[PDB]
Structures are given as structure tokens and as C-alpha cells.
RNA sequence: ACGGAAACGCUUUCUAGCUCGCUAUAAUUACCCA
């Protein structure tokens, strides 16, 4: 067992986003009290359909109204008197600041999630974080990255890490050696929606 | 209606059919219309071929109904999507579904609405 | 004498697995790196093939004396058990690797799952330029389990190799379990436990009562 | 005395089958190990040789007193149900397995199956080198059914060979039940289930209901 | 256009035909085009030659469908693809597949294209 | 009173053995617009 394995701890020092490439829109989530309620928008547009109010969201959908208080679906809920919101998804509570004109945050992201909807961290994230520092600490792979000039200086050069099958060589390929697995999944209690700011 | 005869086709009179910076002649013939924009409308029917594929159409109807408010709601938001839903016919082409295989095809006709955005531009 | 017994297993994922697969006919934005399934239920498959073959090579690091570098140089361990083609009396060896079908996707719609598979995006990074390079590759998911049979035969060819072989098949099933069975693996998408590791006759006589004491010890 | 019973029985199977026809010098990117096709129908057959040869190789290892060089050295309990060549007693000895083709395209057209046979991507990696080589071969799809039949025919006096001769059979099916049939075998691919095993007599006057018992 | 005769030997003409690095005098005379984006459509057109040996017509015309949307998406990908896709009359002989006997005939018309990209460098 | 009559080109025989769909790869970057 020539496997020698390694635990890494990882503490939050800020908030960290990873993944998913989705995007809630600006009408796809809810807040009544404290918490962000993301619901399943085909069960919201389901249970709505049959209140005859599906034309009424239609329209609704395109009304850009001022005061964004009134556009963030909360106004669809509390204009039509809709008090049933009992829909899959999840709530993640609100952070108390980007504040007052309050809950009128545009696109989230969704954070990376497996099948259940328990929020995780892929292994493929960390091991490009790894990679990053490996790559920076060494006056091997530093030099002449940046090469062909072609297009407009394009890419990497990718083989400053020597990688492949490489007919006729033994196989070496040291980030196939580093194997990062994925995290057991956390829960979402631990997701708040920071903003951004430059 | 899009058949599987004719979708590219409608697709790629569709795309040409389509608006162009009338000024800014500096690389002209650039539409009012972006990739990103264009792939984020892709994106609403990349998890519903997957699932035309693998599960059955009574779990999907619910989806596709909600689709339909997804593509009002881009349509909505920027103008240049707005002259795409009408032109290509999205919204008339998206209730005319009512199976499997009318799903696949109209993912397939937004797919071949991107490969034709790619191709001119 | 003649026998064939029959190890049973229950393959549990963890961080699932990726068994690299079909469609040509895929998207322009879905699922690119799509999973090997069942052609009728659509579930996600272990074939027997890239378990037989993750198997030998995890095991040929241990068992081989000289250096592999083809099968057929294995050391009359292995080519009994997985067959050379080379070896006049191992051709046909003595293990048969069925594929491993979705046991538990009843009880994974008791846990909250929408689809038996996810889909997970990759995304390259340039690390001069920044620029990204997407894709969407498909796994099964984590606690999806597997039935997993493996049969045996005994014929008088096996002399008195039967518990050599079931050391080396114990071996190999904890050996996968450090590794990772198909896939990216070195980026998680692999890691497998073997639950109910349980060895059974189903043809001729042949006493299992000593084969399950170095399968659950 | 003359009869010819019929073993109808249903090929089900799981890990489905290859069983290779042409290995001619296929297409750059296409099946490099095709299945054995039909020519009209274009559908799977498990062919009668795949099925003889199986069940005398598996019959062997149980039903030889000695280990046979080849089938002219196979005891007389499998001489006579397979025939011999070089035994003049057991010439046209007794069973016709016959090809199957395919019960359920209806069935699995009914379930969601665009094609009958599938085409299973795989590879190879080098040892050494780790270089991989791949491979495209097809497989007749997991719950296919084949409609297998055999014949025994009930001559001058085997009368008193046909029940341990059944005892055989049976035995055989559940070989195959335990083993593979085919191609690749060892890698997954085999997996057959033999499903209403029904003896008719056809031809003559056997009694089939003390026997039909036997075969549940 | 291509019939049951040159077919094959328009698809030699095309490689030679087509446009290499002049530069990288490391191993030079090498094309701009990478063999994995030829080998992505070959993977395409390798599926319809094996499903046109089994299945009917009819039944694959939504397959065939698609193949435009490919040769045309990734002709906008990558400026190599779309003059493989130009000097190898691609999306014209698209439009001429008609029946089995047609679409095979493409369709081992893009091994042919394959098969000499191989042979050349 | 047909160079004719009588005569199954038939029996036996697994397209089979070996082979990981695998290698590398942070869903990321820029910061604005009316």
C-alpha cells in the first residue's frame, strides 16, 4: 500500500461560492419573514395555475414596476392574497445586512449541490485550488507557461506539468498521483447569499 | 410547428431573420442579440432533454409548463430576446408539444438556434 | 469434482461513480461526458468489465513478482483467476464479473432525489488568460447501491487453490475500496464500499461456512 | 415405439448478450464486435450451435467419468444427446436445439428501447504506458426474450434412458443459468434466464405430465 | 455533390486541400484542424452507419436532423471546423441525403475524411 | 421394359479466450449599465 492518505481540514475564513453555474432569476424566490424561501418555481406555478392566476404571473412577470419591493414575488403573494406556500425547496435566512427597502436582492447563484439537496464540496474544486499553489511554488512550472502567441497569447501551455499516456514512457502523470476526494455534505443552515463588492 | 423535417431550417431563417447593428459599421453586421443571452435561453431546455430521455413525460408537463413562463420572462427583461421569441416561434412552437418526442425536437431547435448564432456572428 | 460458488456483494458509492458511456447524439449544452445506463430502465450500470478490470491491474501491483507490462505476464495468480490468453491451461479462468444493476432506487425516492444520475459541472480554468472551459459529465449518485455477483468455479484443477484464491479475491475487493473504479477519480467520482460480503454454492457441494470467515473478518 | 418431445422454454437475460457473428474489418468509428443478426428482421438470434456447444461444454465438466480431449472422447450420457461422430451408436444422437429469435420486439418496443441491441463503449489500458485503446461492441439489450426449443427424440429402446436423460437437460439449463453464453462472458454479458420450461410431446405417445413436473 | 463512384476521392481531394500550420516548423506541415474535433462527427455519422444498417428510414430522421446542427455548431466553434466543413461539401451533401443508400453513403464519406486526415501527418 | 433401380453431402464442433471508456482539467473570470 504505497497509498498514503492525507485529511485535510478546511475552515471558512470568508464565504466561499463554488459551482452549479445555475441562477436563481429576480422572481424566483420569496421573502416573508427572515428567510430566503427558494421554492420549486413548476410546483409554484402548479399550485397557481389552478387560481386562475397563471395569465395574472404572466403579467406580472414582465410588469417592471418601481420600487423593487414590488417586484420580488413576495408582491405577487401578499397583492393576490396567496398564504399557501407549502412547496419543496429550502430556506436559508437572511444575513440582516444588504439592506429600508429589504429583500430586494436580484440573481443568486445556487451554491453546488448532489442529488438530495444537501449542498457539498467537489473534490474537482479543491484540487484546482491545490493545483493554483503547486503550479505558483515552483520555479519549474512558473517560466514558460504562457506560449504559441497565436490567437492572442491563448492559453497555458499544459505540459510545464508533464501529463498523458505518452506513448513508449512510463506513465508518471503526478495529478493523476494527488487524488482529492469530495466532502461529505454539509447542510444548508450554512448558506447566507452574500453579496459581492468591488 | 417545427417537424423533424424542417426545424433546421426554420432555425436558420430564423437566425438570419434577425435584427443587426444598423449603425456601428466598425465590424459590421453584429446582431442585437449576445451568446450569453442566447445560451442562457439554451439553458432552460438543457435539463429537460436529459430528462425527455430518462423519465416519462407526466413528470415533465409541470416543467414545460413552467418553461413557458421562463421564456415569457426572458422575453420580458431585454429587448433583443423579445425579437427572437417572435421571430423564431417560441412561444407558439412551445405549446405545441404534448409528447416525448416534440420535446426532444424543440430542445433540438434551440440547439440548432445556437449552432446558427454560432455560424453568423 | 465440479462446483461454482457464488460471492455476493452489495456495492455501496460514495462520491459516485462515472462509468464513461454512450450518445454521440447528446446537446450543445446538456450532459457531454454522459454515464453508461441500462438501454431499458435507464439506470445507471457497473458493468462487469471495468470492475474485472479495475480488479486485475489493483491487483497485479501486489501479485506480480517481475513487472506486467502486458496481461498475460501476470503471475499464474491472476492469469487463473481473470485468464491470460497465452497460458494453455489459463484461458477460461475461473471468475465471472456480472454487471452490477441499481438495487436501491426504491429507497433513493425516500431520500429526496429528483433523478437517479446528477450532473455536474467541471469547468477548466486557463491558468494564464483566466478563461473557462466548461462541461457537464454525469455520475450516479452518492448512496446508490448495487447488487454484485461474482462467480467461481471449482473444478479438481482447483486442488486446494480454492482459499489462495479467495484470499486474493478479498484482497481485490478491499484494494478497490482504496481506489476508485472508473472515471475522474483522482477529482472524487469514485469512492465504493463492498457491504454483505457473502460466498455461496450454487452448483455442487462445496462447504461455505469457512469462505465467510475471511470475506466478513 | 417413436416420439418427439418439444423444450419450450424463454431465453430471458440480463447483462445482455454478445455473441459475435462477422469480426470482418468494420467501419473507422463503428461496432467493432457486432452480434449475430438476422437478415430479415435485423434483430438478435442465440443461435443453436452457441446453445449446443455451451451446454455439451458445461455438461462436460459435470457428466464425464474422465476428462474428455474433445467431444469424441465425451462419455455415452453426453454422446447420445449431443451426438458423436466416431461412435457408431450415437451418429444423430437425439437432441435438436434450434435458433431463437427474439420473442419481444413488441414488449420492448412497448418500453421506452430505441434499439434491441446496444453498443457498450470500452477500453483497454496499457500496463505500462497507461495508454488506452478502445472498443465499441454491441450487445443484444438487457431484457430481451428468445424462444429456445429443443426436440428429444424417443426412439427403440431409449425408453429407458429418457428420464435420466431429462434429468440432463435440465441440468444443462441450469449451466447456463450459472455461466454465460457467448461472448466476453467474463466481463459481464451473460446472464440468461430460462423461463417456462414447458415439455410437449409432439410427435408419438409419451406421457409429458409425469414429466412436465420435472422441469416445474 | 457525390455519387456511389468518387465520393471517396473527393474526400482525399478535400485533405490535401485543406489548410495546414506554414508556421511550428517543429514537425511542420501539420493542419490547424485537431483530429478530435473530426473524430466528435465521425462519432456522430458512426452511430447513423451502424442504426441504417438495422433500422428504416423514417426512423431515423430526426437523427439525421441533428447532424446539421452539428456540422454547424461546431463549424462556429472553431475556425478549423468550418473550412473542413467548406472544403469537404458537408453541409451540402446534408441536404442530398434521402435515403439509406444516401445517408450510408455520407456517411462513409466522413470515414473517408477521417481515413486521410489520419494519412496525412 | 429409360446406363437403369436403390443411396439425406451427412455426423461431430460455443466466434471464442485476453482487455478499466480511461488520462489531465476550481463553473470560473471581468466590473459595470440606465
Redesign the pocket.
Known amino acids: 500500500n504505497d497509498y498514503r492518505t492525507f485529511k485535510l481540514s478546511l475552515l471558512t475564513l470568508a464565504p466561499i461560492?463554488?459551482?452549479?453555474?445555475?441562477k436563481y432569476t429576480s422572481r424566483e424566490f420569496i421573502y416573508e419573514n427572515k428567510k430566503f424561501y427558494f421554492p420549486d418555481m413548476g410546483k409554484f406555478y402548479n399550485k397557481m395555475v389552478e387560481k386562475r392566476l397563471a395569465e395574472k404571473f404572466e403579467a406580472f412577470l414582465i410588469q417592471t414596476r418601481p420600487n423593487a419591493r414590488n417586484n420580488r414575488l413576495i408582491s405577487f403573494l401578499n397583492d393576490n392574497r396567496i398564504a399557501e406556500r407549502s412547496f419543496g425547496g429550502y430556506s436559508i435566512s437572511e444575513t440582516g445586512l444588504e439592506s429600508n427597502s429589504a429583500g430586494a436582492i436580484n440573481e443568486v447563484?445556487k451554491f453546488?449541490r448532489d442529488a438530495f439537496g444537501n449542498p457539498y464540496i467537489?473534490?474537482?474544486?479543491?484540487?484546482?485550488?491545490?493545483?493554483?499553489?503547486l503550479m505558483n511554488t515552483t520555479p519549474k512550472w512558473n517560466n514558460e507557461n504562457a506560449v504559441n502567441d497565436f490567437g492572442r497569447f491563448p492559453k497555458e501551455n499544459?505540459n510545464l506539468?508533464p501529463?498523458?499516456?505518452k506513448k513508449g514512457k512510463e506513465?508518471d502523470?503526478?495529478?493523476?498521483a494527488?487524488?482529492?476526494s469530495d466532502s461529505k455534505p454539509f447542510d444548508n443552515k450554512s448558506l447566507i447569499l452574500v453579496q459581492?463588492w468591488? | 410547428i417545427l417537424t423533424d423535417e424542417n426545424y433546421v431550417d426554420i432555425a436558420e431563417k430564423a437566425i438570419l431573420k434577425l435584427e443587426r447593428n444598423t449603425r456601428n459599421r466598425k465590424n459590421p453586421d453584429a446582431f442585437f442579440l449576445t451568446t450569453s443571452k442566447l445560451?442562457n435561453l439554451l439553458?432552460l431546455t438543457s435539463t429537460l432533454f436529459d430528462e425527455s430521455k430518462v423519465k416519462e413525460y407526466d413528470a415533465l408537463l409541470d416543467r414545460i409548463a413552467y418553461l413557458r413562463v421562463q421564456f415569457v420572462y426572458q422575453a420580458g427583461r431585454e429587448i433583443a430576446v423579445k425579437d427572437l421569441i417572435e421571430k423564431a416561434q417560441i412561444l407558439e412552437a412551445l405549446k405545441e408539444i404534448k409528447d416525448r418526442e416534440t420535446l426532444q425536437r424543440f430542445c433540438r431547435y434551440m440547439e440548432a438556434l445556437v449552432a446558427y448564432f454560432k455560424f453568423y456572428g | 469434482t465440479f462446483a461454482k460458488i457464488k460471492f455476493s456483494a452489495q456495492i455501496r458509492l460514495e462520491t459516485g461513480?462515472?462509468?464513461?458511456?454512450?450518445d454521440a447524439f447528446a446537446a450543445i449544452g446538456a450532459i457531454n461526458?454522459p454515464?453508461?445506463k441500462d438501454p431499458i430502465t435507464n439506470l445507471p450500470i457497473i458493468?462487469?468489465?471495468?470492475?474485472?478490470?479495475?480488479?486485475?491491474?489493483?491487483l497485479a501491483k501486489v501479485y506480480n513478482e517481475k513487472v506486467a507490462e502486458?496481461?498475460?505476464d501476470d503471475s499464474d495468480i491472476?492469469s487463473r483467476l481473470?485468464?491470460?490468453?497465452?497460458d494453455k491451461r489459463?484461458?477460461?479462468?475461473r471468475?465471472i464479473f456480472r454487471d452490477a444493476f441499481l438495487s436501491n432506487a426504491d429507497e433513493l425516492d425516500s431520500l429526496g432525489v429528483r433523478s437517479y444520475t446528477e450532473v455536474?459541472?467541471?469547468?477548466?480554468?486557463?491558468?494564464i488568460?483566466?478563461?473557462?472551459?466548461?462541461?457537464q459529465?454525469e455520475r450516479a449518485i452518492r448512496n446508490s447501491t448495487f447488487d454484485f455477483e461474482l462467480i467461481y468455479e471449482i473444478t479438481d484443477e482447483n486442488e486446494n487453490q480454492v482459499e489462495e484464491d479467495f484470499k486474493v479475491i478479498r484482497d481485490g475487493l478491499k484494494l478497490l475500496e482504496l481506489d476508485?473504479?472508473?472515471?475522474?477519480?483522482?477529482?472524487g467520482?469514485?469512492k465504493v464500499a463492498f457491504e454483505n460480503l457473502k460466498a455461496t454454492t450454487v452448483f455442487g457441494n462445496y462447504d461455505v461456512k469457512t469462505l465467510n470467515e475471511l470475506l466478513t473478518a
Open positions: 461560492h463554488i459551482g452549479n453555474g445555475e447563484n453546488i467537489p473534490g474537482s474544486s479543491l484540487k484546482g485550488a491545490i493545483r493554483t499553489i499544459k506539468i501529463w498523458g499516456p506513465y502523470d503526478l495529478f493523476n494527488i487524488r482529492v459581492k468591488d | 445560451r439553458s | 461513480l462515472h462509468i464513461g458511456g454512450s461526458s454515464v453508461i458493468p462487469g468489465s471495468s470492475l474485472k478490470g479495475k480488479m486485475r491491474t489493483l502486458k496481461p498475460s491472476l481473470f485468464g491470460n490468453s497465452k489459463f484461458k477460461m479462468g471468475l455536474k459541472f467541471e469547468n477548466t480554468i486557463d491558468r488568460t483566466a478563461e473557462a472551459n466548461p462541461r459529465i476508485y473504479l472508473g472515471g475522474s477519480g483522482s477529482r467520482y469514485g
